[PDB]
């Protein structure tokens, strides 16, 4: 009954964009034939799906999404736990150094050293990596959303992907041992903080100690 509930839910809100046979309207939507359940999971769970594009709240909730995914697959899969739930902690890896090297070579050019945002050309940008979970990161690098290259499982193995997932989950949630994180970027916030705090306090001390006329 998954294939049945999937089509009805798809025919209501998805055929308008892509098509009756999931082949792609020349103006509205893409083909969607070769994509698996992973693209359906990512795009729907991140709220990027049905649209007129930042992340938002999903409309379908964890059962309709699975039915639509099974339907689109029936015409890249998501990873599940041996109990049928979606994997959350199983996707983490143990080689943080390898994950970090791979991230700095493949991913840091667009997001950041530590998964902050990045600017792209003429509008578009790369988002922050904090509000994404492990399955969302996996499906993101498996399907390659807009302007993001698609990383095949044959060019970037599953174990390397798990190491990268572990590395980003550590780089997004570890406490800074040096004081207040000034935004995660380099010396631009540091120069701002310098001019606004240190020099202001020094000049105020000079005004207090010295005279004026």
């Amino acid at each position: 009954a998954l294939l049945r509930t999937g089509k009805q839910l798809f025919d209501t809100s998805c055929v308008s964009c892509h098509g009756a046979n999931l082949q792609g309207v020349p103006d509205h939507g893409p083909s969607l034939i070769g994509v698996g359940e992973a693209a359906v999971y990512f795009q729907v769970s991140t709220g990027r799906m049905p649209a007129m594009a930042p992340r938002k709240d999903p409309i379908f909730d964890e059962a309709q999404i699975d039915a639509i995914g099974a339907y689109v697959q029936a015409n890249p899969t998501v990873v599940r736990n041996p109990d049928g739930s979606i994997a959350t902690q199983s996707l983490r890896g143990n080689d943080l150094g390898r994950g970090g090297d791979l991230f700095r070579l493949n991913c840091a050019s667009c997001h950041n050293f530590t998964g902050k945002g990045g600017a792209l050309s003429s509008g578009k940008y790369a988002p922050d990596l904090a509000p994404a979970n492990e399955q969302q990161i996996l499906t993101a690098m498996l399907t390659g959303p807009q302007n993001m290259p698609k990383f095949s499982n044959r060019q970037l193995s599953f174990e390397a992907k798990k190491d990268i997932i572990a590395y980003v989950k550590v780089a997004t949630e570890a406490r800074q041992p040096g004081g207040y994180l000034l935004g995660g970027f380099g010396p631009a916030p540091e120069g701002m903080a310098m001019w606004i705090i240190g020099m202001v306090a020094a000049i105020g001390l000079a005004l207090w100690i010295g005279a004026r006329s």
Binding site: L205, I209, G210
Partner: protein
Amino acid sequence: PGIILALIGLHLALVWFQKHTQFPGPGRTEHNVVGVRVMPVFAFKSGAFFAAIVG
């Protein structure tokens, strides 16, 4: 660092021996310096400012 230390030394020596400038005011003239003497007051203020900046 050595070159900067030498240039800072020469700079401060010139400032010490060519006396400081001042703003025009009541008792001020192109020929005098109105202010405070080093010994009790100026050294005290300089040391306090140094401590505050280190803080």
